[PDB]
Chains A and B, each alone.
Chain A
């Protein structure tokens, strides 16, 4: 009976490429690396300013694009779960060596599998120190989202200047996009991979050791 928000969300003349019966979301342009138009719930078309979680909207007038926030959140979910699925399997001995720290706190006779390493080290205190170290990094890197939301920064999403071996230093814009797609494609799978390991070990059937089935 008023004008529907459906028309503000969809393109209405183009279909989504991944889901061909749905109209294309308005923010998905194909310019982002892993973009195949997959947004069947239209979460990029949500008109909220999701940078309000970091700095509230009543602090000052600002607004981040919803697709910029989702890609910054997707890239952080990609890069965390790549290290996390690797670190679960490396400390479980999936790659041959049961890789542990030199301390006896982290030894296999104290922590037999990586399934028990969370609760055993919240109690000891190694996870409380990681929460400080990650929280210090997330405070210095998370404040750039306010600089983007105020329009003062031209920084791309998930685009710190962290290229110490400089793989993308002289590369063209086309092969930079291919490398960003390989980060996204391997990150999307490692997110689902970490969903596999953390759930199959948590069943009542068990198998806290590799291969977790």
Chain B
């Protein structure tokens, strides 16, 4: 995957161009841009599920009510997901790893997931909003009072 393949998704209508004010896509190779895209979609897809989980239980005090066996169970189960994710990227993909030959969004673990490239643009954009949204629900909800002002 090259730099022009990474920057061809998602669409850049709502800003106008590819929005890189610091020029961070110009520093490095196509490998360090594939790391940026894979970590954008991983940050996005977690922040989407983190937003609804606020209103599904609505704050941080529910995490304090999780026991020592409870925190260690889910953190290593998510670690078991992310272990075999980068494993099946390398071993079970026709191109290879996302930094070597694979898709930076492919997220290969069987069972975690269950017109499509148009849905790729709707995944990064819907996760870009939740990244701002859960940054709202951590800062505006908790740390100072009058942030949003919503």
Chains A and B touch each other in the complex, with CB atoms below 8 Å apart: no
Residue positions of A touching B, CB distance < 8 A: none
